[PDB]
Amino acid sequence: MIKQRTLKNIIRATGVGLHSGEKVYLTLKPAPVDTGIVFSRTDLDPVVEIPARAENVGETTMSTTLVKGDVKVDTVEHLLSAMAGLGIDNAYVELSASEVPIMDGSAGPFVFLIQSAGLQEQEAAKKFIRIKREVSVEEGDKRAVFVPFDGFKVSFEIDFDHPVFQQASVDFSSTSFVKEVSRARTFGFMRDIEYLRSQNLALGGSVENAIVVDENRVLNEDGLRYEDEFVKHKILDAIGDLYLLGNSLIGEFRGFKSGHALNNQLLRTLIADKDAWEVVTFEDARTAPISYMRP
Ligand SMILES: C[C@H](O)c1nccn1Cc1cc(C#Cc2ccc(CCCO)cc2)on1
Ligand SMILES: [Zn+2]
Q1: Ligand 1 centre from 291 Cα, in Å?
Q2: Nearest one of 187, 170, 196, 178 to 254, comparing CA atoms
Q3: Which residues form the active site?
């Protein structure tokens, strides 16, 4: 059967929050079956724990923020993307501050650390949420859509009014999340330093953790990791936001200029429409529509 997975070993990492600019220490730990992904602020006394679920998303401005009362865990999406890509069902994520570290701006450092720790299969069937009806949310010209699909696939399209320009579609049962998506970096326009550092955001942002773009070009000296890196990163963001569902998806997501707000809203509409989805397990991995890497 397709079995639940956790980490084989604990792993640690350190870095800076993109938005807050704070040094943060990160600890990923194994967790028992049906725990899901749980974030833990271990700098507070008592320790405050926020399950990574759609219901705990409190802010969606330029990142996906988990919130429980007055306590937040900011920028969960890239880490959650890495967990989903390697099929981690259960894990404690400890943090010494209010934000996941940005690392290099992509999921690469996370997938690397996870696979270094190794994966551990658990004796419980993995639960999947299967999309059985189209579910669509729109707001003005942006749209986010679930469509039934025998597998897992993400299509995205962005329309930035900028000289450097986009669309991509990836089927994750036939192409590698790691090779083709995980290295795609966070990005920001120099245009938006008015906006960002008037809202006191992106305090930790630099060329070390983001593609910086002026009116005409990428300012990073070594340029781009992929020709379509921007749209690839949006796909990475979506995978992260969709994992707040609490179970892995069988279906297709289509994004049209969507982002954190509209992705979360899709999940909330999905959850609410119980005719559009079902929980399923696979007693024989050989007949299942998706597959994962050997542990
Ligand atoms: C964090 C979220 O998941 C995300 N992924 C891609 C973009 N975004 C949104 C975003 C994007 C950003 C950003 C940014 C920025 C701007 C300027 C600089 C350097 C300027 C001179 O050294 C560095 C970084 O902040 N939030
Ligand atoms: Zn991102």
Answers
A1: 33
A2: 170
A3: 260
Residue nearest to atom 5 of ligand 1 (CA): 186
196: left (phi over 0), alpha (psi -120 to 50) or beta: alpha
Q: Which of 260, 282, 288, 290 is catalytic?
A: 260
Lookup: tokens for 136: 């669509």
Token digits of residue 89: 């069902």
Q: Hey, which of 156, 193, 196 would you mutate to test ligand 1's pocket, going by the most ligand atoms within 8 Å of its Cβ? A: 196
Resolution in A: 2.2
* 19 counts as catalytic: no
